[PDB]
Each structure stands twice: as structure tokens, then as C-alpha cells.
């Protein structure tokens, strides 16, 4: 009953429940609604709080939509790139489970006012806003293999002057392209093409202009210049 509760103290109750909301666990007051996740706070709360709470929650919704990309895109029906892109996108969620641990401990001592929260999460509101834009531009147009590596070379060039969201999208591409580059090492120094899922740029067949054919979709758009010398 936060309506019949004092002003300066109920803020310390929201910042406790608010921390739980960042984790994604249903809180006491700041609850979640069934599914882009939309929340509800309370009908009877101070106007100068809800208008401030609703400014933080866009880091919860951008997390209830990245954890749902990790627990999904790790299946075997997607290839060896939509896997590594979902692992290197899981190391970050761990580093966000710590930045909410340091706050759960610094709040015990009373040193965490709501106005103090809106400052500490500023970097965790910008990182979780890049991973929640690749996880929606990889599912918009179904990408697996090469086309999910062309996207991570253009979403990394569009941020050519940010330097805080380019050191990130250069960590995803540098990690979501090792499995693609470990079969290329086998199709360069040798002739064997493993590629269990149909994702590599070159596919074999069963007098020789029809055996190996360049596939047009799965070209990483940064090997486009040498799409011929590879084959």
C-alpha cells in the first residue's frame, strides 16, 4: 500500500523492487505483463516517481528480449554462426548480472537512492540497446550462415564514430565469424568442405562447371571482392 506510505521512504522501496525488475524476476510493485515487453507500475504512486521509473524500464524490456534470443538461437537448426553470435552475446548478459549484484550489495547500506540508480545504469542502458537491435535485425530477415555475417559488418560500419558502440559490434563480429572462418581454412589449404548445415558460400554437388557452385546469398559482403578466387 504505497499510497498510505510516506514519500521519502517509499522511494527506497521502489529502488529495491526496481533492481529485481532489471534482473527480469517479477517484482512486488513493478510487475510485468504478458507479451516489446510492457510493464505496469501502480495506479496510486507519486507523479514525480513513475515518470522517473518509466525512464529506467527500457533497460528491462531490452533485456527480456535479449535473454529470449540466447535461450532460442542456440538450437542446432540454425548453423555454426547463429550459435557463436548467441554465445558471445551471453558473456555480456553475465557482465550485466554482476552490475546488478554490486547494486544489491551497495543498497543494503542505504547508499542507493533512486536518483543514484538513474546514473549508474547509463552504460548498461546503452549496451542492452545494441544487443536488442541485432536480435531484432537477425530475425526480421531470416539470416543464417553468411547473411548473418554481412549484417554484423554493416551494423559495425554505421557506428563509425561512436567508439562506445563500435568497440562492441566489433566484438560480436570478431566472435561470430570464427566458425565460418574455420571451414574457410579447410577450403583454402585443402579441398574438403565439411559445412554440415547448408551455410558456406561454396556447396558441392554430385563436367566440372557444375560440381562446385558459388552460392549468392551466403557471401559475407566483405569477401565480395574475392568471391571468385575462393572458389
Amino acid at each position: 500500500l504505497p499510497g498510505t506510505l510516506p514519500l521519502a521512504s517509499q522511494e527506497s522501496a521502489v529502488v529495491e523492487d526496481l533492481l529485481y525488475v532489471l534482473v527480469g524476476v517479477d517484482g512486488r510493485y513493478v510487475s510485468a505483463q504478458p507479451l516489446s515487453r510492457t510493464f505496469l507500475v501502480d495506479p496510486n504512486l507519486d507523479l514525480s516517481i513513475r515518470e522517473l521509473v518509466h525512464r529506467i524500464l527500457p533497460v528491462a524490456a531490452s533485456y527480456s528480449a535479449v535473454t529470449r534470443f540466447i535461450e532460442e538461437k542456440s538450437s542446432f537448426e540454425y548453423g555454426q554462426v547463429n550459435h557463436a553470435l548467441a554465445a558471445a552475446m551471453r558473456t555480456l548478459v553475465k557482465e550485466h548480472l554482476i552490475l546488478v549484484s554490486q547494486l544489491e550489495q551497495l543498497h543494503r547500506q542505504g547508499l542507493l537512492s533512486l536518483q543514484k540508480l538513474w546514473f549508474y545504469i547509463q552504460p548498461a542502458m546503452r549496451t542492452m540497446d545494441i544487443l536488442a537491435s541485432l536480435a531484432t535485425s537477425v530475425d526480421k530477415g531470416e539470416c543464417l550462415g553468411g547473411s548473418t555475417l554481412s549484417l554484423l559488418h554493416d551494423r559495425s560500419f554505421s557506428y563509425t564514430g561512436d567508439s562506445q558502440a563500435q568497440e562492441l559490434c566489433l566484438y560480436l563480429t570478431k566472435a561470430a565469424s570464427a566458425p565460418y572462418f574455420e571451414v574457410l581454412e579447410k577450403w583454402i589449404y585443402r579441398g574438403i568442405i565439411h559445412d554440415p548445415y547448408s551455410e558456406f558460400m561454396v556447396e558441392e554437388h554430385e563436367y566440372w562447371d557444375q560440381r562446385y557452385t558459388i552460392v549468392q546469398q551466403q557471401i559475407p559482403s566483405f569477401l565480395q571482392k574475392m568471391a571468385d578466387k575462393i572458389l
Partner: protein, 186 residues
């Protein structure tokens, strides 16, 4: 209405969140000596809106270019600090008064005076034409402003010097949005 209650709401009006409501933040009793000092203090928060709307309206459309990002992403490093000051001021409210705020927030009444007037002089400029309209703010002489804007220029003019060092040593210009002053013909 106690003076402490005003100190509670003002620390929110510095952000946009509204006794003090929303172009002057008209406050609505109390003595005249209090309303006047609130009015000027509340108005500083209004400025913060004009600089926030730009870095939110233009962070939406994807047709602002590559320079218009390093500008819209350099108005944020000059806002996290304004969010650190609001952090410190709130920890002491648990003592500071109105006349004590005026000295605390006398300097960020200027940085929020140049930035809130730097985003209006360059409204429709995209590409290099924006890096040329945040350079027309350096001919000012004021040693406090000429050393602030001459830093935002050092970030906004980084993408421009990225095409230049590309179109000189490799001759491969690439800009889906027309920013570079070298226009190719298919």
C-alpha cells in the same frame, strides 16, 4: 509549504520530471522570496529538455548520417556528467538550501546554455554541413566556451576525417548517405 519541500521538487525539475509543474516552470501558498528563486532554478531544467529532445528525436530516424551520430553521441558524454552532479546534490538533501543551490548550479547554467543553443543553430544540417556549423561556434573568444565547443568539434570531425583518409590513400569512397563533398556518378 516548507523550504525543504521545494528543494525536493527542484532536484527533479532539473531533469524534466515535475508543486513545480510545466514554457516557464510555473510554480503554484508560499512567500514571494521563494517563488522567484524557484522560477530561475526550475527554468534550468526546461533547458535540459530542449537538449534532450534533439538527442532523442534524431536518435530515432536512420537517415541522419554518420556525422549526425558522432554529434548526437557526443551530446551524451556531456550529459552523463550532468547526471553525476544530480547524483551528488541528491545525497545531501537528506543540508543545502535554495541560496546554496545558486552557487552549486551556477556553472552548469552555462554549459546547459551553449549546448541548448548549439542544437538550434544546426537543425537541418546533416553530413559535413553539420561539422561546419558546429565550427562557427569557435569564433567566440570566451575561454570557457571556446574550450568546450572546440572539443565537440574534435568528435564531430572524426567521421569527416575518416572519409578523407579513405578517399586519399585508397580512393574508395563509400557513403550511402551523401555526406562527403566528393559526389560520384554511376
Amino acid at each position: 509549504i516548507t523550504e525543504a519541500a521545494l528543494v525536493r521538487d527542484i532536484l527533479y525539475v532539473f531533469q524534466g520530471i515535475d508543486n513545480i509543474k510545466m514554457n516557464c516552470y510555473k510554480v503554484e501558498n508560499l512567500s514571494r522570496s521563494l517563488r522567484d528563486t524557484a522560477v530561475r532554478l526550475s527554468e534550468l531544467g526546461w533547458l535540459h529538455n530542449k537538449i534532450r529532445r534533439y538527442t532523442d528525436q534524431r536518435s530515432l530516424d536512420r537517415s541522419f548520417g554518420l556525422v549526425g551520430q558522432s554529434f548526437c553521441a557526443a551530446l551524451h558524454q556531456e550529459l552523463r556528467e550532468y547526471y553525476r552532479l544530480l547524483s551528488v546534490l541528491h545525497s545531501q538533501l537528506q543540508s543545502l538550501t535554495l541560496r546554496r543551490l545558486l552557487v552549486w548550479t551556477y556553472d552548469p547554467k552555462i554549459r546547459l546554455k551553449t549546448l541548448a543553443a548549439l542544437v538550434d543553430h544546426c537543425q537541418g544540417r546533416k553530413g559535413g554541413e553539420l561539422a561546419s556549423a558546429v565550427h562557427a561556434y569557435t569564433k567566440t573568444g570566451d575561454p570557457y566556451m571556446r574550450s568546450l565547443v572546440q572539443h565537440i568539434l574534435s568528435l564531430v570531425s572524426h567521421p569527416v576525417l575518416s572519409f578523407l583518409y579513405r578517399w586519399i590513400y585508397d580512393g574508395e569512397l563509400e557513403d550511402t548517405y551523401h555526406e562527403f563533398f566528393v559526389a560520384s556518378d554511376p
